[PDB]
Design a protein around this ligand. Sequence first.
Ligand SMILES: N[C@@H](CCC(=O)O)C(=O)O
Ligand SMILES: [Zn+2]
Length: 258
Amino acid sequence: KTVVVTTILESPYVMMKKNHEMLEGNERYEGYCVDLAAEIAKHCGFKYKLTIVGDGKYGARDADTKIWNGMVGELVYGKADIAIAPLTITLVREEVIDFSKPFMSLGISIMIKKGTPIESAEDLSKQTEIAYGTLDSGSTKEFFRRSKIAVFDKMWTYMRSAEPSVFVRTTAEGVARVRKSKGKYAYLLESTMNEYIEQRKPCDTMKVGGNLDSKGYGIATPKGSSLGNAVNLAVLKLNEQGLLDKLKNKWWYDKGEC
Ligand SMILES: N[C@@H](CCC(=O)O)C(=O)O
Ligand SMILES: [Zn+2]
């Protein structure tokens, strides 16, 4: 009856509300995905419960164990009915879960501490002074692991063998490493998160160069779910009405601190 929604604490998508300890259920959270969940639910005609993914991950299949972790895993093993998060539509995921058409368009980009002598991915690859990494488990990490393009293969080769590790557990961890490294650490993350951080105090980071690829985030459901068709139509209806753009403006730029 009540649709269990799996999501992830990733700003500005889902964040803990100021006085959440005094609130209950869905009212404990706020963010772009919280506003979107409320809308997809209204339009699809269902009651839901927001749940933060237990392992705090997006979703990857473990090569040795074959188990799916993160939000994807919660959908695959039936722990959740739908995932409303900045979850990238990829081929390996679409083979096990269903995705609506994209609700947000993005691409991998570079986050530097202001003043870092880096203008592109080619620049990162051609040097060693400045370290660079990605989110440990996710679509960005896989983009480099599977890239046939020379510049990205070179970047991956360095990243996988770099010590100490250049990969981080969460986006926030990557952002702090950038901020605390005096320009000695650049971070590869999706343009959406980069643009969000670029508008947050201490206003010391910046997105550089173009996007490395083009892709989208989709609302995910288990393969052959009943909700699939309706949520896809809701995403299309809401994009066409201007809500998705309105929501990105609200959480990224309207509340900008820089
Ligand atoms: N949106 C990504 C996580 C962030 C990243 O990989 O940079 C995913 O669904 O895996
Ligand atoms: Zn509406």
